[PDB]
Design a protein around this ligand. Structure first.
Ligand code: CLA
Ligand code: CLA
Ligand code: CLA
Ligand code: CLA
Ligand code: CLA
Ligand code: CLA
Ligand code: CLA
Ligand code: CLA
Ligand code: BCR
Ligand code: BCR
Ligand code: BCR
Lengths: 42, 742, 55, 48, 73
């Protein structure tokens, strides 16, 4: 378990997990709000 | 003797080696001092010959890597089958193959990319595919999606089995060295077992499954009314109604009166008028004959018994006029190192791939394949590129062997020494041939351009002013056209419609095949092809032969295989290694393949492909302008590059828009490559010094000190980007044109 | 039984086996030798029969 | 090919194009099911 | 880049329509299609299999330049 956790903390794996999470969040945000060109909340 | 020898649990499976990167090499395993360490960790990952010196470990690693590659390939096949099963219009395309475009991919609706879902046909929207899988499935007899789903599940199961087999053969029972060094048994099993038995089983499948279903489909029966494939096996009455010979059973086969099977084993040749492809009976007959030939040929080498041949005895006992004693110590060389075998197999595979592309474009073996132009173009270009890459890699591995595995004391060969003793004459003659061929081939075009630019069209090398006709090719074409009349009485017609002589074949109002004329332009392009091939051969041979030593550097073998240079002395010694020779020959392979694919595309669009009206006239796509516009460089630039790029640049706002975007993106990448090919390391290092100072001022200095890329790394990056950009540009242009116009 | 093809194949197989015998046995003749001789005789017989039938 | 299956196809020519169109429509809608409304966040468990 | 910008703006101004530059200059595909491919049609037709005109020499020079560029590589 220690060695598996150490391997999971290597740079490419952490990078791909972080970027997958970011891409998913961005895609979901763009799906909920389809188009956006200016900031209209104010 | 021949035996099974294994070692039990040579390695123990654990995650402790996953935590520490670069465990294979001690220098890498020590730790990262600078950033270059990272760039090394991926470069030496697969160099098993440098990790250790024992052949046993290298062989075991190679076996496991092969198993993993097989698992990946099986996963890819399963994915393709699942996509065909779920997201596709195969059932709609089956009924009306001529008026429906195949599609097996569906795009989501997140950003606005839904415009990529074009109107392919059959009540479906998606991306039109050019893999040619639909024709394969139709020729196999598949008429539903449940069978495709079952095939995908089987592929997944086989991929899992391959992965488990790889793990088992590396970590549980690993074969010994003597197991791999038995080439006679391996050759016998690969010839008789892998090739003969597989082709025999495929011929049996074609006889029992493909032929009746395809006959029913060609008759006009609806795909939903065709009996299931196992009904033909279960019901002999159906097969008797279809092919009466089956009513006699297997009795004729043992009775040697094989003529009774003439109904479904024919030798007619030519193309099928209904589908524009080869007859399936001919294919089954060919597979049966090939199975017989391979099964007979698989029993040549002596293994474990008295009868057979010894490869070493055959090599040693060879006597000839020009050879002499010759092949005496080649067996040990071939059975000692992996690199020589890798080079030989790579070259053979590349040549076979090129031959496959030629034979596939010439004689279409699948139904409704000739009339689908995009599939033909994609297959031809893809197979040509793969063959070129393999042929290039063969020389690199040959140079690697000559550098690091060649010693004339323990393992000495006479032929290799004789070749190495007169390399100067070979190089000089090849250089002269390349110079002469290039001068003539390009001077003809330059003379044509100059004469046409001066208002002198009567002085050019053309079909009207000065004719240079390929007489030998025309003679061969006439002989092939007249072949089935007297020389081959068994065949009803000629093998291919390409030969000058015969009739035109068209399917569904579109031309399938017609004889191809040959003129001055074909002469010029063939000579250009020969010139490019000769230059590439010269580069690769000069790289291979002068790897160990040279007149300029007498001890080049001590420096190794991958070194940038020797120094600024001797006037300059940049790019003296064989790796640099391979990196230089990649460019010429790219050039040659690009020229070949351009020639094929223009000639096929101009002289073969087209449409036919009801009256009987044939209108080609470009109206036959190849014979008069391809004799000058301006014609190539205007009538091919400028004229045929209208579709790709005007594809914005349509379903092909993606292609257009690629047509730009690849261009960018190409330019990017130049940055890595025109500069050097010192400038970048000196700039990184100032950048690192600016970082140091704000306490954000990393422990791993940044370093500029090495010279070899920069050259590799440049060549990779160049090749990728060029190939992607050609891909986008070809696909956009052939989809929008055909 | 008794047809021309049967006689031709039988004669070819027997002749090939007899030739392969010389030029638990007094002279070493393992099963592999018999199988190879029979297969070669069968190949020759099939070839000659199909050639004769093709005229 | 025995002209009885051809006659069967002629008799059942209708509804065959309907089945083909339905299969193609289902294959296309397999990607737009969520945007349509069905197969939403509930009932995705062992569904679609 | 500077010369491309100047030439395209002035050629659209002279030709009588300024909307082409005002609309197609905001993306690079417009630069590739409405400037080079469109304007090269008369230049590349200096000499053809049928004949030639007074632009022929320029066409030759065009190709000539390309060759030298490649030789530099
Ligand atoms: C590279 C090949 C090439 C070739 C073959 C030609 C060929 C030709 N050109 Mg073109 N040309 C070229 C490139 C080429 N050109 C280029 C790059 C340009 C510059 C843009 C031009 C520009 C050009 C112009 C401006 C003109 C031509 C014209 C001509 C013709 C004139 C021939 C002549 O008078 O001298 C031939 C002279 C010789 C001495 C021949 C030498 C070769 C001999 C036969 C050697 C053979 C070797 C033998 C086998 C040795 C074996 C030894 C053994 C016995 C022991 C000829 C058909 C002229 C024309 O009007 O034609 C219609 C013309 O006015 N050319
Ligand atoms: C050869 C490799 C291969 C490739 C390149 C693809 C490619 C694709 N798959 Mg396929 N697939 C494959 C094998 C492959 N598949 C296999 C073996 C199976 C069987 C399990 C499937 C089953 C499958 C399903 C069930 C679906 C796809 C879909 C997709 C698409 C979106 C994937 C996604 O966004 O995941 C997101 C990424 C992560 C979860 C991380 C993409 C075009 C999707 C589709 O096209 O929807 C419209 C989809 O629904 N695939
Ligand atoms: C008649 C039986 C036989 C068969 C079918 C094969 C077939 C194959 N061998 Mg060869 N081989 C044999 C005998 C046989 N071998 C013997 C006796 C030896 C020892 C001298 C070798 C030594 C050998 C080596 C060292 C290597 C191969 C490799 C390969 C594979 C080539 C990859 C490819 O071309 O794709 C064709 C793809 C397919 C047809 C996949 C189908 C899966 C097959 C049918 C698996 C069953 C094969 C196996 C021999 C039987 C199982 C026995 C076990 C259950 C007890 C292929 C699976 C190479 C390979 O890729 O390694 C994995 C490789 O590196 N072989
Ligand atoms: C048939 C399979 C084959 C095999 C098993 C090998 C095996 C070997 N090769 Mg050979 N080789 C082959 C074919 C093959 N080669 C071909 C076809 C070529 C011609 C290009 C070469 C040319 C070649 C060179 C020039 C060198 C070798 C060397 C080596 C060794 C090191 C491998 C390595 O570290 O790579 C590990 C993997 C990589 C470094 C990955 C690099 C990234 C690639 C280039 C990118 C491709 C990108 C992709 C296609 C595009 C999509 C982009 C997307 C990702 C965004 C290894 C023993 C090296 C050596 O040192 O030998 C002693 C060496 O210098 N090979
Ligand atoms: C398009 C530009 C270009 C051109 C023309 C050349 C030309 C050549 N290359 Mg280079 N090369 C290039 C780009 C180019 N290269 C690039 C980008 C690379 C990648 C780094 C290389 C890398 C490279 C390698 C690795 C090799 C070459 C070699 C060669 C020579 C091949 C032999 C031959 O065909 O000569 C015949 C001549 C020509 C085709 C050139 C054009 C001549 C025309 C017909 C004009 C002649 C007209 C007349 C005589 C001029 C007189 C006018 C004057 C009096 C005013 C030739 C000099 C090979 C070599 O040198 O071996 C022999 C070789 O091994 N090249
Ligand atoms: C020069 C090369 C040449 C080549 C490559 C072929 C090739 C072939 N011949 Mg032809 N043939 C040739 C010259 C050639 N022939 C000549 C000179 C004659 C006159 C004696 C014939 C008379 C001939 C006959 C009588 C037959 C063939 C047949 C065959 C085919 C089957 C070969 C086989 O028996 O195994 C094959 C296409 C066989 C056939 O047509 O079966 C399909 C066959 O029966 N050929
Ligand atoms: C003893 C008499 C005999 C006779 C009359 C023939 C006669 C014939 N054989 Mg031959 N053949 C023989 C012995 C004989 N064979 C033997 C013993 C073998 C086994 C090695 C073969 C193997 C053989 C093959 C594999 C083929 C022929 C073919 C042919 C036919 C084409 C002739 C030709 O010129 O091809 C050139 C011809 C009818 C060809 C054929 O049958 O085409 C119709 C063919 O492909 N023969
Ligand atoms: C990375 C983070 C992430 C986040 C925060 C969300 C967030 C959300 N998802 Mg998405 N989703 C993601 C990744 C993510 N998703 C991935 C990788 C996939 C592919 C399997 C999906 C596929 C998906 C589906 C199929 C559904 C959602 C739905 C939802 C919503 C549930 C409440 C919410 C907007 C659900 C929803 O509410 O739809 C109406 C829904 O049904 N998501
Ligand atoms: C497509 C595909 C697939 C599938 C496959 C299959 C389904 C296969 C099958 C196969 C098979 C199914 C095979 C078979 C084979 C067979 C054989 C190989 C046989 C043989 C035989 C013999 C050799 C015989 C002999 C004899 C004689 C000669 C005489 C008398 C006696 C006897 C009988 C003994 C999978 C999913 C996987 C993957 C993906 C793709
Ligand atoms: C080119 C290529 C490809 C393809 C491939 C293929 C398509 C393959 C196939 C293959 C095959 C198709 C194979 C087969 C095999 C087979 C086998 C291996 C068999 C075996 C058999 C046996 C073993 C038998 C046995 C028996 C029985 C059962 C009965 C009687 C007795 C006896 C014992 C004989 C791809 C796309 C991937 C890509 C890359 C390249
Ligand atoms: C004298 C004597 C005896 C006897 C012996 C014997 C009787 C032996 C053997 C014999 C024999 C008589 C053997 C063999 C047989 C046969 C075989 C072994 C065959 C095989 C075949 C095959 C393998 C075929 C194949 C094929 C096919 C299937 C198709 C077409 C092509 C071919 C032809 C290739 C005893 C001991 C009683 C006593 C003492 C004395």
């Amino acid at each position: 378990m220690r060695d598996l956790k150490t391997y999971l903390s290597v740079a490419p794996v952490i990078s791909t997990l972080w970027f997958a999470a970011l891409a998913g969040l961005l895609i979901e945000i763009n799906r909920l709000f389809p188009d956006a060109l200016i900031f209209p909340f104010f | 003797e021949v035996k099974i020898l294994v070692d039990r649990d040579p390695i123990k499976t654990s995650f402790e080696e996953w935590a520490k990167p670069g465990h294979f090499s001690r220098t890498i395993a020590k730790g990262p001092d600078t950033t270059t360490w990272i760039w090394n960790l991926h470069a030496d990952a697969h160099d098993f010959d440098s990790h250790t010196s024992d052949l046993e470990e290298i062989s075991r690693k190679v076996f496991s890597a092969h198993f993993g590659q097989l698992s990946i390939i099986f996963l890819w096949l399963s994915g393709m089958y699942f996509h065909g099963a779920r997201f596709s219009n195969y059932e709609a395309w089956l009924s009306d193959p001529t008026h429906i475009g195949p599609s097996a991919q569906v795009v989501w609706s997140i950003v606005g990319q839904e415009i990529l879902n074009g109107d392919v046909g059959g009540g479906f929207r998606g991306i039109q595919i050019t893999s040619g899988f639909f024709q394969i499935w139709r020729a196999s007899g598949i008429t539903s999606e449940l069978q495709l789903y079952c095939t995908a599940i089987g592929g997944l199961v086989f991929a899992a089995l391959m992965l488990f087999a790889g793990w088992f053969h590396y970590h549980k029972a690993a074969p010994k060295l003597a197991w791999f060094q038995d080439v006679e048994s391996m050759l016998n099993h690969h010839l008789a077992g892998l090739l003969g038995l597989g082709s025999l089983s495929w011929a049996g499948h074609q006889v029992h499954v493909s032929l009746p279903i395809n006959q029913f489909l060609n008759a006009g029966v609806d795909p939903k009314e065709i009996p299931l494939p196992h009904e033909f096996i279960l019901n002999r009455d159906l097969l008797a109604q279809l092919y009466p010979s089956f009513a006699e059973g297997a009795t004729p086969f043992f009775t040697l009166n094989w003529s009774k099977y003439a109904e479904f084993l024919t030798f007619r040749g030519g193309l099928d008028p209904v589908t524009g492809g080869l007859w399936l009976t001919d294919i089954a007959h060919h597979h049966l004959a090939i199975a017989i030939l391979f099964l007979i040929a698989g029993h040549m080498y002596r293994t474990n018994w008295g009868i057979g041949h010894g490869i070493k005895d055959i090599l040693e006992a060879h006597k000839g006029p020009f050879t002499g004693q010759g092949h005496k110590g080649l067996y040990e060389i071939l059975t000692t190192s992996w690199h020589a075998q890798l080079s030989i197999n790579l070259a053979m595979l590349g040549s076979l791939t090129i031959v496959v592309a030629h034979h596939m474009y010439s004689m279409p073996p699948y139904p409704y394949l000739a009339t689908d132009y995009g599939t033909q173009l994609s297959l031809f270009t893809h197979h040509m590129w793969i063959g070129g890459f393999l042929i290039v890699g063969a020389a690199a591995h040959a140079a690697i062997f000559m550098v690091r595995d060649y010693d004339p004391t323990t393992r000495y060969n006479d032929l290799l020494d004789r070749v190495l003793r007169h390399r100067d004459a070979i190089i000089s003659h090849l250089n002269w041939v390349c110079i002469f061929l290039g001068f003539h081939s390009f001077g003809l075009y330059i003379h044509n351009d100059t004469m046409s630019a001066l208002g002198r069209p009567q002085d050019m090398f053309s079909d009207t002013a000065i004719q240079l006709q390929p007489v030998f090719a025309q003679w061969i074409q006439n002989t092939h056209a007249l072949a089935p009349g007297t020389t081959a009485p068994g065949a009803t017609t000629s093998t291919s419609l390409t030969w000058g002589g015969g009739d035109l074949v068209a399917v569904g109002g579109k031309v399938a095949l017609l004889p191809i004329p040959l003129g001055t332009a074909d002469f010029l392009v063939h000579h250009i092809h020969a010139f490019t091939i000769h230059v590439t051969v010269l580069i690769l041979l000069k790289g291979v032969l002068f790897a160990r030593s040279s007149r300029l550097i007498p001890d080049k073998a001590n420096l190794g295989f991958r070194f940038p240079c020797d120094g600024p002395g001797r006037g300059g010694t940049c790019q003296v290694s064989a790796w640099d020779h391979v990196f230089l020959g990649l460019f010429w392979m790219y050039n040659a393949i690009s020229v070949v694919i351009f020639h094929f595309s223009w000639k096929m669009q101009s002289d073969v492909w087209g449409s036919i009206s009801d009256q009987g006239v044939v209108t080609h796509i470009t109206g036959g302008n190849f014979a008069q516009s391809s004799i000058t460089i301006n014609g190539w630039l205007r009538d091919f590059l400028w004229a045929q790029a209208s579709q790709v640049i005007q594809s914005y706002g349509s379903s092909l828009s993606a292609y257009g975007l690629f047509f730009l993106g690849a261009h960018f990448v190409w330019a990017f490559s130049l940055m890595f090919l025109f500069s050097g390391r010192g400038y970048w290092q000196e700039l990184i010094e100032s950048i690192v100072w600016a970082h140091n001022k704000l306490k954000v200095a990393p422990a791993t000190q940044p370093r500029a890329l090495s010279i070899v790394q920069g050259r590799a990056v440049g060549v990779t980007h160049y090749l990728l950009g060029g190939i992607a540009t050609t891909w986008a242009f070809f696909l956009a044109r052939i989809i929008a116009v055909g | 039984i008794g047809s021309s093809t049967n006689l031709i194949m039988v004669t070819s197989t027997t002749l090939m086996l007899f030739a392969g015998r010389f030029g638990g046995d007094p002279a070493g003749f393992t099963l592999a030798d018999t199988l190879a001789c029979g297969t070669v005789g069968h190949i020759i017989g099939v070839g000659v029969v199909l050639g004769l039938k093709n005229i | 090919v025995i002209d009885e299956y051809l006659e069967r196809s002629k008799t059942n020519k209708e509804l065959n194009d309907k089945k083909r169109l339905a299969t193609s429509g289902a294959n296309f809608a397999r990607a737009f099911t969520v945007q349509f409304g069905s197969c939403k966040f509930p009932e995705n468990f062992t569904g679609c | 880049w500077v010369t491309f910008y100047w030439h395209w703006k002035h050629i659209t101004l002279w030709q009588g329509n300024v909307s082409q530059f005002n609309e197609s200059s905001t993306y690079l595909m417009g630069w590739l299609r409405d400037y080079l491919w469109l304007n090269s049609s008369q230049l590349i037709n200096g000499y053809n299999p049928f004949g030639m005109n007074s632009l022929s020499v320029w066409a030759w020079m065009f190709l000539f330049g390309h060759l030298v560029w490649a030789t530099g590589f």
